[PDB]
Amino acid sequence: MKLLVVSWGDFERWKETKYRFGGETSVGPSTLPILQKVIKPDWTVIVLSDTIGKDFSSVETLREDVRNRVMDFLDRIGAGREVDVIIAPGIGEFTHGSFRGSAMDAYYYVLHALSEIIPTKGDLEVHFDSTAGLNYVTLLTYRALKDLLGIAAVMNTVTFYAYNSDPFVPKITKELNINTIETTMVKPTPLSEPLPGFDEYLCPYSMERAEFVRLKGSLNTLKNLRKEKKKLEAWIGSLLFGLPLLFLEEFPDIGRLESYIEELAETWGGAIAVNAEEKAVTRRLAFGSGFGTLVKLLFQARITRGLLVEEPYSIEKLYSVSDRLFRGSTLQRVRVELGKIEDKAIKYARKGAFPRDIPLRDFLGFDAANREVSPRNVLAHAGLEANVVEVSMEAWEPKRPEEEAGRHTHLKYTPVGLKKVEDIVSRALKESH
């Protein structure tokens, strides 16, 4: 999968010039044609500001006006129509009309937009062009792209190239070169934020206190997320800290996450006041960081959903999941911790013994010294702590028990144990933020 992403300002105001890139030359007002010629991307994404729109009879007429103008410009230049146009909510008071709202809305909106576009399976070659973009939307677009590609890199190889052209001086210019200003092997960065307080999902930009309170108190998301908050943070921590059993047991419901994001996005959309005569858009609600954390969480869940299996979890499964989610000292520590439980199950098998619903402490042979569940022991032992995990060996007829024990050995958290682990991982995730 090759992806081309370009950040555009007022594309209509650009002058004709010549562009050098990768042994090709191009006449025209935009880099997109030559970019598409040289790179030959599988898909193109154009990101520009609302503030180019000149129709205020509705919000849907404003997006469609900007879209048509972009499609018309794609015909003017050699550009293909295989593209997604993200119309970002931009700020400023212009001659053709006024746009008020939180500046940060552009980031959350583009993050949301790209989280529905960037494929969640297979490798990713991403190309980002900033040659004639607005400074702040290009920063926020750049930021939103890197935040999702960081999560994508957990499961797949991701390569990021950025471009910018030589600056344009009028009539002095002859052939502007398109420079490569970044070539990056994107580092795997799983989500490492907790879900924030319920003030930080939607905030009031230009709205009376009581009307915001009503909208806020109308949201099913905030209500449902109050009692789900701990389980989701436990799941975020499972990737961050190397807890493969918690990853499987706490795997979130993608349907509910979709539902939470859809609702917050619809509410934000519904609160955009478009006054038709005086030519003015007011975004009466602002997106908060909690919206962003939800978009990243859903995306990470989509990226890792191929690993989830049904409830009996074998040692062999925990190995294969771990080898995909984890790297460096984290992966090697998880393999050593699982191995210790494996070597014990091999021993049990050679004696023709196959325990059922046995605490891991009783399985491994533990003193009656320490039954209290500590952060130290939960985080240092890949979450496979002896007082919270239950083991089951499914009886078989051994011949080569060293290779058969992992398939027949299953680990699960006790109802009480799971709740103790959720508290520790949730607290650890907030303490590291």
Ligand X SMILES: Nc1ncnc2c1ncn2[C@@H]1O[C@H](CO)[C@@H](OP(=O)(O)OC[C@@H]2O[C@H](n3cnc4c(N)ncnc43)[C@H]3OP(=O)(O)O[C@H]32)[C@H]1O
Ligand Y SMILES: Nc1ncnc2c1ncn2[C@@H]1O[C@H](CO)[C@H]2OP(=O)(O)O[C@H]21
- Using CB under 6 A, list all residues that contact ligand X: 9-10, 13-15, 17, 29, 49, 51-52, 94, 131-135, 165, 167-168, 176
Of these, 61, 156, 159, 179, which contacts a second copy (CB under 8 A)?
A: 179
Of these, 243, 272, 341, 391, which contacts ligand Y (CB under 6 A)?
A: 341
Q: How far is the CB of 9 from ligand X (least distance, A)?
A: 2
* Cβ–Cβ under 8 Å, residues 125 and 43: no
Binding mask 363-382 for a second copy (x = CB under 8 A): ------------xxx-xxxx
Alpha carbon distance 347, 353 (integer Å): 9
Q: Which is nearer to a second copy, 136 or 251 (CB)?
A: 136
- State the residue for tokens 């048509």: 68
Q: Which is nearer to ligand Y, 265 or 384 (CB)?
A: 384
* Cβ–Cβ under 8 Å, residues 257 and 300: no
Partner touching 364 among a second copy, ligand Y, ligand X, none, CB below 5 to 8 Å by kind? ligand Y
Alpha carbon distance 362, 265 (integer Å): 50
What backbone torsions phi and psi does residue 102 show, to the nearest 5 degrees? -60, 130
- State the residue for tokens 């580092």: 187
According to DSSP, the β-strands at 202-204 and 17-21 are: unpaired
Residue of closest CB approach to ligand X: 9
∠ CA 12-279-200 to the nearest 5 degrees? 90
Q: How far is the CB of 235 from ligand Y (least distance, A)?
A: 20
* Cβ–Cβ under 8 Å, residues 176 and 166: yes
Q: How far is the CB of 79 from ligand X (least distance, A)?
A: 14
Q: Which is nearer to ligand Y, 112 or 381 (CB)?
A: 381
Of these, 337, 342, 390, 422, which contacts ligand Y (CB under 6 A)?
A: 337
What are 96's two structure tokens?
Answer: 């053709």
Alpha carbon distance 400, 403 (integer Å): 6
* Cβ–Cβ under 8 Å, residues 305 and 122: no
Residues forming contacts to a second copy in the complex (CB under 8 A) are 51, 90-95, 102-104, 106-107, 130-136, 138-140, 142-143, 162, 164, 166-167, 169, 171-174, 177, 179-182, 185, 187, 192, 240-243, 327-333, 335-336, 375-377, 379-382, 428, 432-433
